[PDB]
Amino acid sequence: KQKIAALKYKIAALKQKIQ
Amino acid sequence: MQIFVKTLTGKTITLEVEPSDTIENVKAKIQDKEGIPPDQQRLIFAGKQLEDGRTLSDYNIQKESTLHLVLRLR
Amino acid sequence: EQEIEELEIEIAILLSEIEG
Numbered sequence: 298k299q300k301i302a303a304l305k306y307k308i309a310a311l312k313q314k315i316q
Numbered sequence: 317m318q319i320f321v322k323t324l325t326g327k328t329i330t331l332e333v334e335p336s337d338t339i340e341n342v343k344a345k346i347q348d349k350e351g352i353p354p355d356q357q358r359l360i361f362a363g364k365q366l367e368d369g370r371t372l373s374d375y376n377i378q379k380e381s382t383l384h385l386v387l388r389l390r
Numbered sequence: 391e392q393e394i395e396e397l398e399i400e401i402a403i404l405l406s407e408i409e410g
């Protein structure tokens with residue numbers, strides 16, 4: 298569950314970056 | 317020509333390829349360099365996952381392009 | 391492990407929209 302939360306955090310950060 | 321394949325773990329693999337190489341063949345080349353069975357490889361480029369039967373040229377992959385590699389058990 | 395893999399594919403998809 299820590300891995301899942303870190304991956305979701307990366308996804309959100311990447312989406313902001315792409316925007 | 318040479319292309320690069322990057323993992324999410326910080327690894328970069330250099331490959332020697334032809335524009336007409338199939339993705340299946342690129343996966344075999346990754347196996348040669350890394351020991352990763354092709355079944356476990358997912359290759360991703362320019363926002364899409366790559367299907368085995370198409371060529372690098374079909375996906376518009378040029379010299380010095382970077383692909384991304386994710387490992388999947390199934 | 392399955393859900394970790396799905397999230398990794400998404401990261402790679404997004405990263406490949408920058409690193410290509």
Ligand SMILES: *C(=O)CCc1cn(CC(*)=O)nn1
Pocket residue numbers: 298299300301302391392393394395
């Ligand atoms: C595979 O993804 C099964 C889900 C899962 C993840 N974790 C570690 C937390 O991220 N445990 N089970």
